[PDB]
Design a protein around this ligand. Sequence first.
Ligand SMILES: Cc1cnc(O)c(C)n1
Ligand SMILES: Cc1cnc(O)c(C)n1
Lengths: 227, 221
Amino acid sequence: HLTLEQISLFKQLPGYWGCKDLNSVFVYANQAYGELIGLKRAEDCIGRTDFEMPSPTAACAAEFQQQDRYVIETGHSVKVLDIHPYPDGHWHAHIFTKTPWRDSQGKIQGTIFFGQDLTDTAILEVGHWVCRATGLSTSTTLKLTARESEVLFLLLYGKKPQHIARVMGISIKTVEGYEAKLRSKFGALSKDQLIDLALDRGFGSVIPKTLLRKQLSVVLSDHTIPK
Amino acid sequence: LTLEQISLFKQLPGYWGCKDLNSVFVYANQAYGELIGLKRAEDCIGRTDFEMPSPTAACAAEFQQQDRYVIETGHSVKVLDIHPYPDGHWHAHIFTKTPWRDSQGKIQGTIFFGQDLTDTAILEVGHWVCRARDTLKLTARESEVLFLLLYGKKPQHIARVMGISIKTVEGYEAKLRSKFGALSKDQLIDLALDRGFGSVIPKTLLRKQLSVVLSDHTIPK
Ligand SMILES: Cc1cnc(O)c(C)n1
Ligand SMILES: Cc1cnc(O)c(C)n1
């Protein structure tokens, strides 16, 4: 059995986290998540779905549940970029980790969600260094528009044009125009080479500022470093 | 706690736990125990970082210096940790360290929360790692020295990280100053930040043992 001292760690572990059952009905949410989602007491989440929270995040509950069902049906964990207006009147950005929740015999019985704030330390501007065979190099242009920057960021995290068009609220053909502009600016011969050239220049380290005021919930491809 | 809450607590992601004011472990989750070589995670309790069955203990003094800073300031810090582990492999993590408070709000220790270094974890700390004339060119070792200088490592600490002599580090330091046109270490760091080097983690550091604070943040009252 846990001591009260250890239970205080359960109460104080940072982040925004909880678990849901197989129908994405909340089973627990910590106090930080409850306050973020507009509730006075986080216990008031229990028995509700994402559609039923007093929060604009509920506009994206279908996407949350599609992510949950993917975790449940494959057993894979995902990382989700979540950008929403919240009942406190501010836009927030988080990465939510979603993993299977298992019972005592190892069977999947729901999902665990674990969110961390994206701070200004993650919204830097792109530098001017380039990966080399050894070390790095810099000069002494790749100036991108807002839409171009948003398309590039999503491409670098594994998103297809159909995903990007749905995230940005534009047509697939419009995304292809931005892809072509990006390929020209980077001098890339292919979409795959565009990704390589952009990654070697630090474009993966920067969330475009205009993305921080677009409501979205999108799984980001995630791989260990190094690999 | 209810049965569901205990189950959730045992399965929350990450590598985490808490330590008292002397950095003696009070709790570690199953993932941290397994990572550190203690499959029965309760075996962590009552030990310090010096007493774990892991090559990480070579950096226990640095872990405790970080803990004391969190305890004395109330700030949170994010730490880049790269260590060999008892499974025989190098692992890189971001460890976030936060004050642990008692029922009356007094700091009683630290909470540590580690995440595997992945694409999204490094995005969260605003850095990036490389995968596989008028131009300024850094070599692998120059970039290692510049990175460690950027985050406050002494030449002797840099020598220990890179396994080289302190005279060799001073040679790299002098080469960096000429390429950047700096006349001192402070001008060098200032010029490297202006060109955006503050977001780089040299890829060769992923197989060198280090524990480096990347950021320190005020927690709002
Ligand atoms: C804000 C948010 C986004 N995705 C989720 O799954 C939850 C529970 N909350
Ligand atoms: C691996 C590691 C690094 N820093 C720490 O403080 C702990 C507890 N573990």
